[model samples]
Target: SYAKKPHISALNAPQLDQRYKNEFTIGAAVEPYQLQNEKDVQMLKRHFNSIVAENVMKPISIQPEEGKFNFEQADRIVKFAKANGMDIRFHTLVWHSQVPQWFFLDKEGKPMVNETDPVKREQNKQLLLKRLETHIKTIVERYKDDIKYWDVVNEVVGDDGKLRNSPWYQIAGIDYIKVAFQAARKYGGDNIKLYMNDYNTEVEPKRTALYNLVKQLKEEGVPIDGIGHQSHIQIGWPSEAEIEKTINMFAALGLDNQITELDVSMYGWPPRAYPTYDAIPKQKFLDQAARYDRLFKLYEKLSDKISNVTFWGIADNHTWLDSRADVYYDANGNVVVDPNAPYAKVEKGKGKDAPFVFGPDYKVKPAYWAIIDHK
Candidate 1:
């Protein structure tokens, strides 16, 4: 196989390649921000029929700095998805972490949090219930028909598999999850399927907790429809049995499973390459392919129960997982790492890791091909 001109327009053209004739249809997860060149829009349309946005169309991206509603950035993405006949997925709607301060507080400049000691909890509970209702109403009303699925609640719980104790929960309570789903139902109603997304639900306790949560939603008459076990995974962290159990258990619930935000990294593979708060280089093409062989076998299994699988983005030039831009700082504001030098957010020797599977062009490697062959 000979590599030709550098332009992907020429490289990825379907008619030109006859070597790989297996009908494993391929899809790439992408973000609008990655299309900085503008001209790349045409290039993207040529390649993908399914798209997963990173943050361009997020609630924060659409309504940054509160009061201000900026649809310009997201509109381009929505229009592009439509023009290409691509299926669109909104990564999230009710992430308690990214909500701007203005959304939670009042116009009179009062903190949404009522720590006055007498019914502080109750006060917060009311404020966020109102906010959840507003968020579901506004966002859902706008995109009801255009977007098919929504990540209703994202990473609300921790890795230890407990719900996060942030303001969304501490103030709004676990009941907030139910309210958010109900609110989405009121607005999205019969049009959209709400999804609960988290990084790894393959772990036993955590997966079981999510199963219980989804079951409760069903029992309460919530119109929650799908589950997103975001396979933004690291090899070896979740055993094959854990992954299989997660898919089977959720499938038995009769809910659609989506492999949302998948990407296996050569360096982040648990027992092999490592990940850190700072330094890790994108590896050679051959190394990535070798790892993808095993990774795609798992993807074949992931496809068994999952209705759709979406990777985080398309190429290395735009991958957040491999970004080498700028530096690092602590919460207190110290110039922690050099501006351009690679510096990690996790401790230098902590030995943390991520999922594995990447190729030279940053598109589907053999792991992608494996899924193609198997599918």
Candidate 2:
């Protein structure tokens, strides 16, 4: 009877993929290997209208050996989306992480240059532009027709509201963000919307920093079209008011707002929280669902200002936090329990990060109905 009820994949059920189409797109991130998964593909077809490559499209995955390119897996994902008639969002074009180490190396495989070295500074700047141009243009051109959005730059800002001292920041200053967007537009054209994405953007000072950066970019005529909030939230980190404030500030600036990486972690609840997935009480599940429901309700109100809300992944079985080490702490952030004691082994490695709408077996959970049942 439960299986007969409304769910994401059932044809007769309330289809979120279709329901949200009028307001905005609902999306999910996936690895290339997920294309081969029959169940995963089926779930995707029924629930999501947009696809984002989790890691396959990153610099390391695509251009590991300098100019040598590997588009096999990324191509498969693009093809999968096209065949399914789903819009694709290229995960990222520029990032400080997951870049090939050689990207900062020279022909002799040495560090490119120290910023202080004025002689090599000019050459290094040239090298940065050339690499940024080549890498971005190559990938954008290949998937230009298929991808509707591109995360041109990602996670460039730190929690303290300062730009991270990355290779790009050190070599090219903040202009790297502008150059990345420009290259995407040059190759992908005006049809492809360019986005600047980041995590923990739901609260200040990161929220303020992201807003300032985006405003500055827009004022300078950067080709940036939107800002993505990787809303990787917890049970009660940022109150709903704080969340709405951040969204309102960005929306007022006339830029598209997207929830790029959405997932609510049950770990580290301020009060007595479950130390592991198995330890979760029934109320905890309902609480998680309620948290998600509140956000979606807010999303509905701000639907006009939001373009897309993409879940980081579909199922709880393989989330990014699945392997979060089993360490428990108290309200004061002190050790509460001992993992070495009894009940510790059962608490480890069961993928305690059960923060998805679907369970391990792909069964729809309360989190699924939370959205569907929400008025």
Candidate 3:
């Protein structure tokens, strides 16, 4: 019965926000498209108290050009949140990815980071900083009253406990991060909580690196209010001990903690492509349910430290993992395993890597029950 489909209404699931009302706000990263659907809208209203735009609030989406700003898409989400009494989490202001090319391009139409001449390097640095300030100020001012949390700088540190050599880093060094936070703080007022968000924060050298970076930022008085652990994890990895250690370690810093992007993929690291949905062993679903239960238990235990917990997506149907891992069926009823795909390192017989509390049919999955019952 592992493959059996069950709608959410059929299960009479408990409201997530109500269930965890006193603990922390429950959230999901949602797209405007999902809000248009009636069932998806109901799910959001019933279960979630907070919402973060999956991609609409990103640098590229908000400011596609240097001075041009677009808010039509993001505004819809904000309006929805306001109407539903749900709080909004402004996803990001300074991310290396999803950033416009104009952010790093110089007057000569060249990449600013490649400017080796000492004088030109300093000029490019000022120019980039000015752009960063303008971008942050514009977005923050527009939504300062509505947004409570802002991911100011995202994925700045690499996996090796050092800064990722992105254009922002190469151009202005650490000052870009500092200025981004400062700009957000300046316009976000005293109410906004700024965050430095990253993925794999519970892992090795990356964890140490992130810790050191946040520590340095705090010492410098960067106005950083929290650390956003993008827990885009898979089942049976990053043991519970590691998760607990990471949360406690960050908590000791006297900063708030948030699970900014939580999703439990079925596949493990060095992601392999699963041939079909049925090919996945029933044990995997049970394992995923147990994993979610354990994770929620941990979050509840550490609720004092964690102020908010957000699932990366609303349901398995819209998970970014499907495209990232390329787990889809072809026209001939066979799972298309693209060996050359970025996430497909090994071709193995497994099931589709669906990773949310709800299934594709908008039904509650075992993982949902696992968290709700908490047995």
Candidate number of the best lDDT: 3
TM-score of each: 0.76, 0.89, 0.91
Query: Candidate 3's residue-wise lDDT over 1-375, tens digit each?
Result: 323434456124678778788889999999999889887888898889999999999999999988899999999999999999998898889888867988898888899877889999999999999999999999999999999999999999998878998889999999999999999999889999999999989998999989998899889988999999999898877888899999999889988999999989887555655755556666777889889888999999999999999999887767777655544455555654443443313334334567888877777887887776545
Candidates in order have lDDT scores of: 0.61, 0.79, 0.84
- Candidate 3 achieves a global lDDT of 0.84
TM-score of 3: 0.91
- Model 3 scores worst on lDDT over the 10 consecutive residues at 341-350
lDDT of 3 at 107: 82
State the displacement of the C-alpha of residue 254, model 3, in Å, after optimal TM-score superposition.
Answer: 0.6
Instruction: List the lowest-lDDT window of 10 residues for candidate 2.
Output: 341-350
The candidate scoring highest on TM-score is 3
Summarize candidate 1's per-residue lDDT along 1-375 as a digit string, tens digits.
Answer: 112212233225442112222422234566666566543454456555567678866667767665466767667777777876776777687786677766656434566565555565576667668867776677778778787778888988776777877667766667889888888888887878789998878875677878888888788887778888777655344565677778788888878777777765434422222334224433333444444455555556565566666667655444555542222445653334332433345333333222322333334433334333423
Worst 10 residues of 1 by lDDT: 15-24
